[PDB]
XYZ file of N, CA and C in Angstrom:
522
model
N -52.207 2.634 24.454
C -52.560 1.477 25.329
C -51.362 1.095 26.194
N -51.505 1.284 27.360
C -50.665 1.066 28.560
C -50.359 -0.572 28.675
N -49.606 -1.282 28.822
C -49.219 -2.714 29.320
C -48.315 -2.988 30.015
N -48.713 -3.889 31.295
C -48.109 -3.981 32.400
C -47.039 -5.109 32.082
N -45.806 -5.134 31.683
C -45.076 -6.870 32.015
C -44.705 -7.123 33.015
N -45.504 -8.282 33.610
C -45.354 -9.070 34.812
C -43.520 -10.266 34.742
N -42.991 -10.234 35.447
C -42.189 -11.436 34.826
C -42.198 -12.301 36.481
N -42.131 -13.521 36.166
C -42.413 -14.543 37.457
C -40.782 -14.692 37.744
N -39.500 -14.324 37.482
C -38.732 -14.836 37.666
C -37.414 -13.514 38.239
N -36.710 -13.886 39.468
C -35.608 -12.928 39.950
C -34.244 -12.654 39.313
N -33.858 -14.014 39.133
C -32.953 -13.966 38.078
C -32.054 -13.334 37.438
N -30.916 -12.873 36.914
C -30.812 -11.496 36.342
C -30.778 -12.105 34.724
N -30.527 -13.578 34.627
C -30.310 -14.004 33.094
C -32.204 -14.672 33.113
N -32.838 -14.401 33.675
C -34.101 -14.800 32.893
C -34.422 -14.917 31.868
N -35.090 -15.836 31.247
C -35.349 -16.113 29.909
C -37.236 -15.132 29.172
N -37.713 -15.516 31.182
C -39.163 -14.845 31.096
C -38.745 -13.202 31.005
N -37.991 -13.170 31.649
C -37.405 -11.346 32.064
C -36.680 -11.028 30.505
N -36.058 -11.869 29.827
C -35.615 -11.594 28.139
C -36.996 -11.749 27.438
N -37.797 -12.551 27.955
C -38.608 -12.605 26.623
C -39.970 -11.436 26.570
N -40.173 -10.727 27.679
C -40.876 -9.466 28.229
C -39.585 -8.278 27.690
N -38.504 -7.947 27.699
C -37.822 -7.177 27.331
C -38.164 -7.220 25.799
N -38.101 -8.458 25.269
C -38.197 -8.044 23.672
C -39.046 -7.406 23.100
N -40.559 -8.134 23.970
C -41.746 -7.681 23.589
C -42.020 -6.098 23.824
N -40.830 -5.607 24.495
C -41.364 -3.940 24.488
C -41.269 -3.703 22.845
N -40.346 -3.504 22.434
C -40.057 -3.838 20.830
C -40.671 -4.073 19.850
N -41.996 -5.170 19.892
C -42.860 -5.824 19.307
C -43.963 -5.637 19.488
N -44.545 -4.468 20.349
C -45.521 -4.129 20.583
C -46.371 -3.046 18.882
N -47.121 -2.859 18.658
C -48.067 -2.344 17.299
C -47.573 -0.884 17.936
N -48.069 -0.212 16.912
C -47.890 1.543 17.245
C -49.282 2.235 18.086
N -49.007 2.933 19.132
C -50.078 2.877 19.781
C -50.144 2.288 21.202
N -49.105 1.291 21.536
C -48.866 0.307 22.829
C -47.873 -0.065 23.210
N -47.520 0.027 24.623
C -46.213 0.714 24.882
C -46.526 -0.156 26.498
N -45.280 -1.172 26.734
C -45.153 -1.819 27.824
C -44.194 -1.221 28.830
N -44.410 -1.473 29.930
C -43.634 -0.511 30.947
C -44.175 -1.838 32.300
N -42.682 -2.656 32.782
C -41.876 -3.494 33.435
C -42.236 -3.553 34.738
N -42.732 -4.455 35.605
C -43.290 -4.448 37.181
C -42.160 -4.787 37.609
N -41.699 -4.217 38.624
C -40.613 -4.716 39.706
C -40.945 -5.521 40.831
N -41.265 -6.963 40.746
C -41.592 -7.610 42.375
C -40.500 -7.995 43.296
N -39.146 -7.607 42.618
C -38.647 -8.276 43.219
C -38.220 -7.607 44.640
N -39.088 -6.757 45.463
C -38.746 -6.278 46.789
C -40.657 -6.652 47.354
N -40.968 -7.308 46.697
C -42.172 -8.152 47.333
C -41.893 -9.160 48.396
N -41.865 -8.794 49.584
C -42.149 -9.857 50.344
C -42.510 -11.259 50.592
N -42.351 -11.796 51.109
C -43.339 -13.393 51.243
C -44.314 -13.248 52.109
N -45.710 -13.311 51.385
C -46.917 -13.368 51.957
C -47.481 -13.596 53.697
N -47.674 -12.581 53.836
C -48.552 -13.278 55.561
C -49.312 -12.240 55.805
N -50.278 -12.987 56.386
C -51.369 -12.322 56.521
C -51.845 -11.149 57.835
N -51.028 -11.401 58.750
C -50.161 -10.418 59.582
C -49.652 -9.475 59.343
N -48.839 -9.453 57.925
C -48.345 -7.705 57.433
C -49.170 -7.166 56.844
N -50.074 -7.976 56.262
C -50.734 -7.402 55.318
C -51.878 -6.663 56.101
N -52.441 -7.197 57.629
C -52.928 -6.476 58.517
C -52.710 -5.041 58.732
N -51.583 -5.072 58.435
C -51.296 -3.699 59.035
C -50.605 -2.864 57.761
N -51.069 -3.262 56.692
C -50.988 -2.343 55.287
C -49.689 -2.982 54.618
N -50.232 -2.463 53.480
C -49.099 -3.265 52.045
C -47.557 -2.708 51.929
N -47.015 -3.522 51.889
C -45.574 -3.285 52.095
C -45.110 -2.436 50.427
N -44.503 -1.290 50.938
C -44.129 -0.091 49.834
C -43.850 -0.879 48.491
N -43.093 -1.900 48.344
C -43.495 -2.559 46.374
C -44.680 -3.458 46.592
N -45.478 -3.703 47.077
C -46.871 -3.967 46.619
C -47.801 -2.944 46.699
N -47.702 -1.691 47.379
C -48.403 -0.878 47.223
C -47.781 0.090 45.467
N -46.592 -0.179 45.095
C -46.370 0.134 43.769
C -46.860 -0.827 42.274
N -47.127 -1.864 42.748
C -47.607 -3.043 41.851
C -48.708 -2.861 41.884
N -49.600 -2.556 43.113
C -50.808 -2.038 42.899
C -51.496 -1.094 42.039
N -50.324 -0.031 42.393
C -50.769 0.792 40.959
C -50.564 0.849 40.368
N -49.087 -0.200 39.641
C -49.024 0.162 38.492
C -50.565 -0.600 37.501
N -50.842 -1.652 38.391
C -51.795 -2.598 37.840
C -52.861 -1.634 37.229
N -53.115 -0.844 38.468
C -54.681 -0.002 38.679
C -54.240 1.091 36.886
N -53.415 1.376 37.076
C -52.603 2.377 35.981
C -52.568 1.640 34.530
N -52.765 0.512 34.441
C -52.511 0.242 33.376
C -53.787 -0.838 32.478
N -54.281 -0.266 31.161
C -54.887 -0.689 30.120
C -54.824 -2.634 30.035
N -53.704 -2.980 30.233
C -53.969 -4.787 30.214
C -52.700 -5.100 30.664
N -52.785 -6.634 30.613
C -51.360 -6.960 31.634
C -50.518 -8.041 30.630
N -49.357 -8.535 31.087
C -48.874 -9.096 30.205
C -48.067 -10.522 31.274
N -48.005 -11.105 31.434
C -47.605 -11.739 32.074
C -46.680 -13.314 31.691
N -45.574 -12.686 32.218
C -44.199 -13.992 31.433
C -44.106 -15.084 32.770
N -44.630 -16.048 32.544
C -44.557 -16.910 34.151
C -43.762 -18.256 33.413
N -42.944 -18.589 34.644
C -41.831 -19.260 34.441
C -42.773 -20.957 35.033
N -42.023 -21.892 34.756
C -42.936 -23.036 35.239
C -41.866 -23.796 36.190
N -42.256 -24.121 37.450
C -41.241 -24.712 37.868
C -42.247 -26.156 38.542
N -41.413 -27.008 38.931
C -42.439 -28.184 39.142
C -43.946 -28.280 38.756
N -44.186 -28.416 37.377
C -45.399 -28.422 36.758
C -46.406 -27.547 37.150
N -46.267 -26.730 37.592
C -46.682 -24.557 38.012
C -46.501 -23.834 37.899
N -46.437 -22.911 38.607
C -46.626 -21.209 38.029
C -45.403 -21.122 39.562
N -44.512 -20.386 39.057
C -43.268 -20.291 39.998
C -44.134 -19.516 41.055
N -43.644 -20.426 42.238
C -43.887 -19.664 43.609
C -43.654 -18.330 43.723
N -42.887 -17.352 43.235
C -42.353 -16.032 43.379
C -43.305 -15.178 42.866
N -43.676 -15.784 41.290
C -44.724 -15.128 40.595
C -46.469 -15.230 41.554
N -46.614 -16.647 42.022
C -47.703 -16.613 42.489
C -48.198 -15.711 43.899
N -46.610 -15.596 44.533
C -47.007 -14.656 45.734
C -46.958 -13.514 44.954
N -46.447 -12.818 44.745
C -46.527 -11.152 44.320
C -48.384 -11.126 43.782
N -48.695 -11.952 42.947
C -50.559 -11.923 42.517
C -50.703 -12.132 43.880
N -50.739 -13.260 44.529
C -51.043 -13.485 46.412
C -51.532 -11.756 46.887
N -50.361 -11.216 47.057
C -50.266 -9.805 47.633
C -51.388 -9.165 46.700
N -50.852 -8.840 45.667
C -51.953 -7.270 44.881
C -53.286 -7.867 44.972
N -53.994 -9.225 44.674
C -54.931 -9.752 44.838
C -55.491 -9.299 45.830
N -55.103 -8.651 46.759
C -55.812 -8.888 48.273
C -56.522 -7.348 48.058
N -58.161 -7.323 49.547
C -58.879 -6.205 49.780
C -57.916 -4.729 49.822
N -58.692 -3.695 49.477
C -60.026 -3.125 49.031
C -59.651 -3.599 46.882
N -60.935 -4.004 46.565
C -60.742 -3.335 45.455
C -59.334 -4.141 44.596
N -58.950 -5.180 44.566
C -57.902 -5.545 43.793
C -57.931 -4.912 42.359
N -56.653 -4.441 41.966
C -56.573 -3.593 41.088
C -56.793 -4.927 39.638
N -56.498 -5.857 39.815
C -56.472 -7.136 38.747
C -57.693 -6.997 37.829
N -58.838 -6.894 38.490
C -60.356 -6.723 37.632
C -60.955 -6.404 37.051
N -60.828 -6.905 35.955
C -61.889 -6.577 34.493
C -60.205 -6.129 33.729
N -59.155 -6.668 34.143
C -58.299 -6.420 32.840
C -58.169 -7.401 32.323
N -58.094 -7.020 30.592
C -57.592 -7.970 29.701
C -56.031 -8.107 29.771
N -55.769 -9.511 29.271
C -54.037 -9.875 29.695
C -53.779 -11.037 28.520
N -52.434 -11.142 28.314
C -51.936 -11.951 26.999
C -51.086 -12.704 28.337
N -50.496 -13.799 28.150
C -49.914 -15.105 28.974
C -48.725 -15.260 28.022
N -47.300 -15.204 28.294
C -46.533 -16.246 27.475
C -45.314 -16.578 28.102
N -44.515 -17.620 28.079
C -43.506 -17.814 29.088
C -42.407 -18.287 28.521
N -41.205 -19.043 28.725
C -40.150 -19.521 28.697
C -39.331 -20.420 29.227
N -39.063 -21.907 28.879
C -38.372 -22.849 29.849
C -37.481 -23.324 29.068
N -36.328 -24.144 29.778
C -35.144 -24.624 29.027
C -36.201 -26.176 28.977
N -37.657 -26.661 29.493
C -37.735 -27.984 29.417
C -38.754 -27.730 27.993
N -39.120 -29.340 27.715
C -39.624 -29.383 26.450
C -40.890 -28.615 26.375
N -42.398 -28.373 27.595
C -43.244 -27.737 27.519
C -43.622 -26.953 27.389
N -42.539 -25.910 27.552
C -41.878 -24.428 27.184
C -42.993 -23.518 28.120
N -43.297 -23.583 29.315
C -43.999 -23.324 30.621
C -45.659 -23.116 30.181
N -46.228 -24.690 29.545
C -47.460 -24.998 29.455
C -48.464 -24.719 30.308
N -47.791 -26.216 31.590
C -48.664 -26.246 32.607
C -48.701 -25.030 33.960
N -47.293 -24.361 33.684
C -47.072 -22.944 34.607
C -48.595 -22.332 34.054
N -48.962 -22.241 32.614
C -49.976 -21.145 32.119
C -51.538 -21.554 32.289
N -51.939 -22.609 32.145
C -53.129 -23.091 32.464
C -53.553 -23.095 34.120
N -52.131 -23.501 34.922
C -52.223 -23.298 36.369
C -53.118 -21.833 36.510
N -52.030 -20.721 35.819
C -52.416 -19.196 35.884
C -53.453 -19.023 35.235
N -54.246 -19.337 34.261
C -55.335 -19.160 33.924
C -56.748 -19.307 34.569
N -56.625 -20.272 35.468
C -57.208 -20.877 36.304
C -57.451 -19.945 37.885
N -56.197 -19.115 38.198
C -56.214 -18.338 39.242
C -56.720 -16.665 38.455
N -56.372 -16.515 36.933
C -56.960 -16.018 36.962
C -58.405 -15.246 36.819
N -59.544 -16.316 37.087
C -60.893 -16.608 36.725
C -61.082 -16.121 38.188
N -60.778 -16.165 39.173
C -61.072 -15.949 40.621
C -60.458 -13.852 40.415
N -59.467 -13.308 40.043
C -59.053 -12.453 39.434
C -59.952 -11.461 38.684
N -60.688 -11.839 37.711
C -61.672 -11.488 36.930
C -60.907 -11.037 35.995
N -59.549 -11.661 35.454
C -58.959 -10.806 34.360
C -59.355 -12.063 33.022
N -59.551 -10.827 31.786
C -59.651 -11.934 30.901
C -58.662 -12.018 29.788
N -57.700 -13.116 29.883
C -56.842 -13.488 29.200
C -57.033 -13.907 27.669
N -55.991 -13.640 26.441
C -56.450 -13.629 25.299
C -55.997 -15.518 25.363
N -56.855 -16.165 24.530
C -56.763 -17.760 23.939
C -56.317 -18.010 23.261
N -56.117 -17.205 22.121
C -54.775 -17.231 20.759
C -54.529 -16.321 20.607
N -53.042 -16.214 20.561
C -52.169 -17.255 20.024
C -51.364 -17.611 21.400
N -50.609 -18.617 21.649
C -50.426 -19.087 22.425
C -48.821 -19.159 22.376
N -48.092 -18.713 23.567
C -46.749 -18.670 23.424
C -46.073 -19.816 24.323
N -45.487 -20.099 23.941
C -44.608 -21.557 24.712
C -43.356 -21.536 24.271
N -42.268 -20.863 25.084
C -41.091 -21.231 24.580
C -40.011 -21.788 24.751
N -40.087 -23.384 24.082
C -39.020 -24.365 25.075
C -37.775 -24.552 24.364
N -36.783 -25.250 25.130
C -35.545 -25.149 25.251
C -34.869 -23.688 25.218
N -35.452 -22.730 25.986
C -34.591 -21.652 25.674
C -33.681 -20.999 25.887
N -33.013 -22.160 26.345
C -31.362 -21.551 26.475
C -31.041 -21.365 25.036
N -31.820 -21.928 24.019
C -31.377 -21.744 22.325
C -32.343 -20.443 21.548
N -33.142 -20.402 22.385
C -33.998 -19.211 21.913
C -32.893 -17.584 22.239
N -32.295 -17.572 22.988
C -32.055 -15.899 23.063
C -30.137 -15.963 23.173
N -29.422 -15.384 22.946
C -28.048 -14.905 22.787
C -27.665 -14.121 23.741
N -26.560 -13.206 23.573
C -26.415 -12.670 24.676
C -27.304 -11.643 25.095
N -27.198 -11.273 26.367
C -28.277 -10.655 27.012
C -29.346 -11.106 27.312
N -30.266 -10.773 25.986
C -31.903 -11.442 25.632
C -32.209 -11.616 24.662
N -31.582 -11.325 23.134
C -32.067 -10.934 22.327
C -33.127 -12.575 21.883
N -34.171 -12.669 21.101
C -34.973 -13.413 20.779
C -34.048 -13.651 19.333
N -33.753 -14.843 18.883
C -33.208 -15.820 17.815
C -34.613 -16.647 17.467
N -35.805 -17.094 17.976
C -36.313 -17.394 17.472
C -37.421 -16.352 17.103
N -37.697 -16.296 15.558
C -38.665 -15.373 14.784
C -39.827 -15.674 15.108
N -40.296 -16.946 15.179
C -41.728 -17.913 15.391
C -42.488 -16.838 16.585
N -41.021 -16.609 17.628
C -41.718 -16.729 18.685
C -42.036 -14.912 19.012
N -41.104 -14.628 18.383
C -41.244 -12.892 18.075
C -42.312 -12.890 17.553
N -42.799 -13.326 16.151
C -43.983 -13.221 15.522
C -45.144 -13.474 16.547
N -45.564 -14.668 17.027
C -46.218 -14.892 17.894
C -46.428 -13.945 18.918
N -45.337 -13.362 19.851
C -45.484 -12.289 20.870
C -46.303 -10.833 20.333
N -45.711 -10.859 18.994
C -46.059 -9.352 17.720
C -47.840 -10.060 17.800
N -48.435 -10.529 17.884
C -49.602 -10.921 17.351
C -50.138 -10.739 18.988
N -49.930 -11.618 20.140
C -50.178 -11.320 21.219
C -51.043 -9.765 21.487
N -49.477 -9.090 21.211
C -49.664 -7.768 21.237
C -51.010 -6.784 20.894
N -50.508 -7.074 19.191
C -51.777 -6.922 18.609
C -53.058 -6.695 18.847
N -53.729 -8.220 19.356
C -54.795 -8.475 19.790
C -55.037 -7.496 21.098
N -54.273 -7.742 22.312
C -54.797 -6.420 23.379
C -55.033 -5.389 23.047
N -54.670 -4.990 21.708
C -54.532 -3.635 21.302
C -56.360 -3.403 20.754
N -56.394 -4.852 20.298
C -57.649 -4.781 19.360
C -58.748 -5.091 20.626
Protein backbone atom coordinates (compact mmCIF):
# COMPACT_ATOMS: atom_id res chain seq x y z
CA UNK A 1 0.00 0.00 0.00
CA UNK A 2 1.44 3.17 -1.45
CA UNK A 3 0.99 6.55 0.85
CA UNK A 4 1.34 9.89 -0.19
CA UNK A 5 2.73 12.44 2.85
CA UNK A 6 1.43 15.69 2.17
CA UNK A 7 3.16 18.25 4.64
CA UNK A 8 1.50 21.97 4.67
CA UNK A 9 4.64 23.53 5.85
CA UNK A 10 8.25 24.99 3.99
CA UNK A 11 10.17 25.22 6.80
CA UNK A 12 13.23 23.17 7.14
CA UNK A 13 12.58 22.62 11.18
CA UNK A 14 8.85 21.70 10.65
CA UNK A 15 7.20 20.01 13.21
CA UNK A 16 4.36 18.77 10.38
CA UNK A 17 7.51 17.85 8.03
CA UNK A 18 9.05 15.84 11.53
CA UNK A 19 5.96 14.40 12.32
CA UNK A 20 5.34 12.81 8.49
CA UNK A 21 9.12 11.77 8.63
CA UNK A 22 8.46 9.61 11.66
CA UNK A 23 5.47 8.13 10.38
CA UNK A 24 7.50 6.55 7.50
CA UNK A 25 8.77 4.35 10.44
CA UNK A 26 5.40 3.58 11.90
CA UNK A 27 3.78 2.53 9.10
CA UNK A 28 2.39 -1.76 9.51
CA UNK A 29 4.32 -4.17 7.15
CA UNK A 30 2.94 -3.95 3.83
CA UNK A 31 2.79 0.21 3.66
CA UNK A 32 5.30 2.29 2.77
CA UNK A 33 5.04 6.30 2.61
CA UNK A 34 6.93 8.19 0.04
CA UNK A 35 7.09 12.40 0.71
CA UNK A 36 5.33 15.16 -1.79
CA UNK A 37 7.55 18.00 -2.58
CA UNK A 38 5.31 21.37 -2.95
CA UNK A 39 7.61 23.36 -2.22
CA UNK A 40 8.37 24.59 -6.04
CA UNK A 41 4.46 25.00 -6.31
CA UNK A 42 3.65 28.20 -7.36
CA UNK A 43 0.96 30.64 -6.14
CA UNK A 44 -2.22 29.93 -7.77
CA UNK A 45 -3.70 31.86 -10.90
CA UNK A 46 -5.78 31.00 -13.06
CA UNK A 47 -3.89 32.37 -16.06
CA UNK A 48 -1.00 29.76 -15.68
CA UNK A 49 -2.95 27.28 -15.11
CA UNK A 50 -4.53 28.22 -18.65
CA UNK A 51 -1.82 27.39 -20.27
CA UNK A 52 -0.86 24.01 -18.37
CA UNK A 53 0.45 22.94 -14.90
CA UNK A 54 3.58 24.17 -13.82
CA UNK A 55 6.36 21.06 -13.79
CA UNK A 56 5.86 20.38 -9.58
CA UNK A 57 2.21 20.30 -9.91
CA UNK A 58 2.24 18.28 -12.77
CA UNK A 59 4.57 15.90 -10.32
CA UNK A 60 2.05 16.12 -7.34
CA UNK A 61 -0.35 15.16 -9.71
CA UNK A 62 1.01 12.03 -10.11
CA UNK A 63 2.32 11.28 -7.42
CA UNK A 64 -1.40 11.62 -6.07
CA UNK A 65 -2.79 9.61 -9.20
CA UNK A 66 0.19 6.92 -8.14
CA UNK A 67 -0.66 6.45 -4.92
CA UNK A 68 -3.14 3.95 -2.76
CA UNK A 69 -4.20 6.89 0.05
CA UNK A 70 -2.90 10.12 1.23
CA UNK A 71 -1.64 11.29 4.36
CA UNK A 72 -1.75 14.68 5.10
CA UNK A 73 0.27 16.79 8.04
CA UNK A 74 -1.43 20.41 7.84
CA UNK A 75 -0.09 23.00 9.97
CA UNK A 76 -2.81 25.55 11.44
CA UNK A 77 -2.11 29.02 11.16
CA UNK A 78 -4.78 31.69 12.08
CA UNK A 79 -7.48 29.17 13.00
CA UNK A 80 -6.88 27.20 9.27
CA UNK A 81 -5.30 25.13 7.16
CA UNK A 82 -1.93 27.07 6.23
CA UNK A 83 -2.26 29.01 3.08
CA UNK A 84 0.77 27.09 1.42
CA UNK A 85 -0.88 23.77 2.09
CA UNK A 86 -4.24 25.03 0.76
CA UNK A 87 -2.78 26.33 -2.57
CA UNK A 88 -0.73 23.30 -3.63
CA UNK A 89 -4.64 21.16 -3.11
CA UNK A 90 -5.85 24.72 -5.04
CA UNK A 91 -3.50 23.53 -7.99
CA UNK A 92 -3.79 19.44 -8.17
CA UNK A 93 -7.57 19.97 -7.49
CA UNK A 94 -8.02 21.55 -10.75
CA UNK A 95 -9.55 19.90 -14.47
CA UNK A 96 -9.15 17.06 -16.24
CA UNK A 97 -9.82 14.44 -13.79
CA UNK A 98 -8.28 15.60 -10.33
CA UNK A 99 -6.16 12.92 -9.23
CA UNK A 100 -7.65 13.53 -5.30
CA UNK A 101 -10.89 11.18 -5.97
CA UNK A 102 -12.13 8.37 -4.31
CA UNK A 103 -8.84 8.31 -2.13
CA UNK A 104 -8.87 7.31 1.30
CA UNK A 105 -6.57 9.69 3.61
CA UNK A 106 -5.61 9.79 7.49
CA UNK A 107 -5.28 13.84 8.71
CA UNK A 108 -2.77 14.63 11.55
CA UNK A 109 -0.82 17.76 12.33
CA UNK A 110 1.39 19.68 14.73
CA UNK A 111 1.43 23.17 16.57
CA UNK A 112 3.51 24.78 19.28
CA UNK A 113 -0.34 26.29 20.32
CA UNK A 114 -2.61 24.45 22.72
CA UNK A 115 -5.09 22.96 19.80
CA UNK A 116 -2.36 21.11 18.37
CA UNK A 117 -3.80 22.12 14.58
CA UNK A 118 -7.63 21.19 15.39
CA UNK A 119 -9.32 23.79 13.56
CA UNK A 120 -6.43 23.66 10.55
CA UNK A 121 -8.15 19.81 10.28
CA UNK A 122 -11.85 20.22 10.28
CA UNK A 123 -11.21 23.40 7.92
CA UNK A 124 -9.50 20.42 5.61
CA UNK A 125 -12.04 18.04 6.08
CA UNK A 126 -14.53 20.16 4.89
CA UNK A 127 -12.54 20.98 1.51
CA UNK A 128 -12.11 17.67 1.43
CA UNK A 129 -15.87 16.55 0.75
CA UNK A 130 -15.79 18.82 -2.49
CA UNK A 131 -12.38 16.47 -3.23
CA UNK A 132 -14.23 13.23 -2.87
CA UNK A 133 -11.46 11.90 -0.64
CA UNK A 134 -12.53 9.94 2.32
CA UNK A 135 -10.71 10.66 5.38
CA UNK A 136 -10.36 8.13 8.36
CA UNK A 137 -12.50 9.66 11.84
CA UNK A 138 -10.44 7.75 14.38
CA UNK A 139 -8.12 8.13 15.73
CA UNK A 140 -7.44 11.55 15.72
CA UNK A 141 -4.00 13.22 15.89
CA UNK A 142 -3.44 16.65 17.46
CA UNK A 143 -0.16 17.54 18.45
CA UNK A 144 0.24 20.54 20.72
CA UNK A 145 2.97 22.32 22.17
CA UNK A 146 5.41 20.75 19.95
CA UNK A 147 8.32 22.33 20.32
CA UNK A 148 8.29 19.53 23.39
CA UNK A 149 7.12 16.77 21.27
CA UNK A 150 10.34 16.16 18.96
CA UNK A 151 14.36 16.68 19.77
CA UNK A 152 16.80 17.16 17.53
CA UNK A 153 16.03 16.92 14.02
CA UNK A 154 12.47 15.23 14.37
CA UNK A 155 12.61 12.53 16.34
CA UNK A 156 8.92 12.02 18.10
CA UNK A 157 9.44 12.03 22.28
CA UNK A 158 5.97 11.73 22.55
CA UNK A 159 4.84 7.78 22.45
CA UNK A 160 0.95 8.78 22.68
CA UNK A 161 1.44 10.36 19.59
CA UNK A 162 3.63 7.68 17.75
CA UNK A 163 1.08 5.17 18.92
CA UNK A 164 -1.71 7.14 17.59
CA UNK A 165 0.08 7.85 14.06
CA UNK A 166 0.97 3.60 14.27
CA UNK A 167 -2.89 3.14 14.42
CA UNK A 168 -3.66 5.92 11.75
CA UNK A 169 -1.58 3.88 9.65
CA UNK A 170 -3.02 0.79 10.32
CA UNK A 171 -6.44 1.58 9.53
CA UNK A 172 -5.56 2.82 5.68
CA UNK A 173 -4.02 -0.30 5.48
CA UNK A 174 -7.28 -1.99 6.61
Amino acid sequence: IKVLGISGSLRSGSYNSAALQEAIGLVPPGMSIELADISGIPLYNEDVYALGFPPAVERFREQIRAADALLFATPEYNYSMAGVLKNAIDWASRPPEQPFSGKPAAILGASAGRFGTARAQYHLRQTLVFLDVHPLNKPEVMISSAQNAFDAQGRLLDDKARELIQQQLQALQL
